[PDB]
Design a protein around this ligand. Structure first.
Ligand SMILES: CCc1cccc(CC)c1O
Ligand SMILES: CCc1cccc(CC)c1O
Lengths: 168, 168, 168, 168
C-alpha cells in the first residue's frame, strides 16, 4: 500500500476482528429492540433504547472501517453470528445482557489499545481514545444506573412499567 | 346504473352489511366512551381512547358508503343493534371486548376481500387494502400492546389509574 | 398470539428468511462501499452509491421485522453470511454483482407475494406491493441504466473515472 | 525558565528541528504551486491544491513554535533549504513528490512522539496526537486517492486536464 506507514499486520487484523464484534453487537441490539416491540412484551421505551444502541454500534463499525482504509489496511469481513438469545426475558434480564455485551466490547478496545501501544502506533491509540473508550465508559455507567433503578423497582410488573414510562 | 361496471350484486350486498357492522362498532365505542366518563368510573384517558375509536369507525362506514355510490351500488341501511353490554367493567374488560370487536371487523374485511377476489373486482380489493386492512392490523397491534401493559399492572386499582395516566 | 389473525406459519417463516436476505444484502453493499473507498481504488461516487444501498436494505429488513410483530409473528434471526467476495474488481464488475443481488431479492419478494396469495393473506400482499416491489423495479432499472453507460465508456481507466465523476 | 516543567532538552531540540522541516515543506509547496501557475504548465486546480498545502505546513510550524514557548522551550531557527527541484514535471510527478514529503513529515512526527513517550512527556504526546498525527494520516489518504485517479487517467494530456478540471 502506497500510503501505509507504521501500521502493523497485527493491528490491521485486530481492527477487522473488532469490526466483526461491533457488527455482532449491533445485531444483538436489533434483536433486543424487536423483542420489546412484541405485542406480548410491549415496552416501547425499552425497544427504542436498544434500537438506538443498534444504530450506535453499527456506526462504530463503520468508523473502524473508514480508519482501516485511511491507514492503508484492508477490510476483511466474516460471518455475523446470530445473537445468543431468541427471547430476552424481562427488562432486567435484557439490561444485564447489554452490560455483559458492552464490557466485552470495552475489553476488546482495551486489548487493541494495548496492542497499538506495544506496536508504537500512536495514531491508533489516539483514535480509540477519541472515539470509543470514553463512549463505552459513559454507556456502561448509564446501564449500571438503569440496572440499579430496575432492581430497586422489582410488584415486578408495576416496576417494569414504571421504569419504562418514567426513565426510558 | 349508467356507471356500474364489474360490480357484482354479491359485493354490493356485502358492502351494505359491512357498513352496518362499522356503524354498530361506532355505537359500541360510543357506549364504552360514556361508561368511562361515569362519575363512579372516572377514567378520562380511557373515555377519550374509545370516543376517538367511535369516530374512526363512523368515518370507516362513510367511506364505504361513498365507495358504494362511486361504483353505482345502492346503499341500504338496517337497524343498528344496541351494544352487547350496558356496563363495561374494568379497563381490562373493556380492552378485551374492543379487541374481540376489531377482530370481527377485520374478519369481515378479509371475507369481503375474498369475495372481491373471487368476483375479479380489483378496484374493491385495492380499496380495502388501501383504507381498511392496514388500519385494522395497526389498531389490533396497539390494543394488544395495551392489553399486555394493563395485565402487567394488575394492586388492581393503582394499576388501572397508572395506565390511564401514563399510557392513555 | 392474542393479535394473530390470518397469518400462516409459512408466511411467518418466509418473512424471517427474507429479513436474513435483506440484512445479507446490506452487508454485501457495506463491503462494496468500503472497497471503493480503498486508496488503491479511490472512486468516491461509487463508494457513496453502495453505502446508500446498504442503508436502504437495512431499512427494508427493519420494515419487515416491524410488520412481523404487527401481525403477531415472531422474529427469528440467523447468521449473516459474509459477502461472496472480498474484492469487487471494477465499477463494471461491481454493478453486475449488484444487479444479480437485486434480482435475487426481487425473486424472493415475488415468491413471498405468491405464498401470501395462495394463503389468502391480502395484508401481506399489499405490504409487499406498497413498500418493496416498486422500489426493486425502480432500483433494477437504475442499475441497468448504469451498466449500459459504464459499458459504453469502456480507454477503460478514463471511462471509469468519467462515470464516477459525471453520473454518480 | 520559570515555567518549564517536565520538558526535556531532547524534546526542545527535536521540536526546533520539526519546525524547520515544516517550514521547508511549506517552501516546497510554494515552489510546486507556482510551477503549476506557469503559462506553459497552466493547471490552476493543481496550483491551488499546492498553495493551500503551503499555507497548512506554515500554520503547522507556527503551532509548534507557540507550543515551544508555552512549555518554556526556546525557538531556534536554521536556514531553510531550497526545495529539491526547480521544475516539477507532470501532476503525477508532483503528487508522488508530495506523498514522499508527507511521509517524511509523518515519520518525523512519529519519532517525536516516541521521544516524548520515552521522556514521559504526556503533554507533548497529546499535542502531536491532537494537532498533527490525524491531519497527516487524512492528507496522505487524500494524496494516495489522487495518485490512483491520476494513474487511471494516463492520452496523458487529456487525463491531466480532466483530473485538474473534475477532481481539483
Ligand atoms: C443496524 C442493524 C444491522 C445489524 C446487523 C448487520 C447490519 C448490516 C449493515 C445492520 O445494518
Ligand atoms: C507559506 C510560504 C512560506 C514559505 C517559506 C517560508 C516562509 C516564511 C514565513 C513562508 O512564509
Amino acid at each position: 500500500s502506497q500510503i501505509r506507514q507504521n501500521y502493523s499486520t497485527e493491528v490491521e487484523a485486530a481492527v477487522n476482528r473488532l469490526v466483526n464484534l461491533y457488527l455482532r453487537a449491533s445485531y444483538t441490539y436489533l434483536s433486543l429492540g424487536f423483542y420489546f416491540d412484541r405485542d406480548d412484551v410491549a415496552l416501547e421505551g425499552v425497544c427504542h433504547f436498544f434500537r438506538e444502541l443498534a444504530e450506535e454500534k453499527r456506526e462504530g463499525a463503520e468508523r473502524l472501517l473508514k480508519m482501516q482504509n485511511q491507514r492503508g489496511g484492508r477490510a476483511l469481513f466474516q460471518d455475523l453470528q446470530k445473537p445468543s438469545q431468541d427471547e430476552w426475558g424481562t427488562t432486567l434480564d435484557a439490561m444485564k445482557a447489554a452490560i455483559v455485551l458492552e464490557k466485552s466490547l470495552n475489553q476488546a478496545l482495551l486489548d487493541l489499545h494495548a496492542l497499538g501501544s506495544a506496536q508504537a502506533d500512536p495514531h491508533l491509540c489516539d483514535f480509540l481514545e477519541s472515539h470509543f473508550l470514553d463512549e463505552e465508559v459513559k454507556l456502561i455507567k448509564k446501564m449500571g444506573d438503569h440496572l440499579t433503578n430496575i432492581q430497586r423497582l422489582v410488584q415486578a410488573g408495576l416496576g417494569e412499567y414504571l421504569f419504562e414510562r418514567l426513565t426510558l
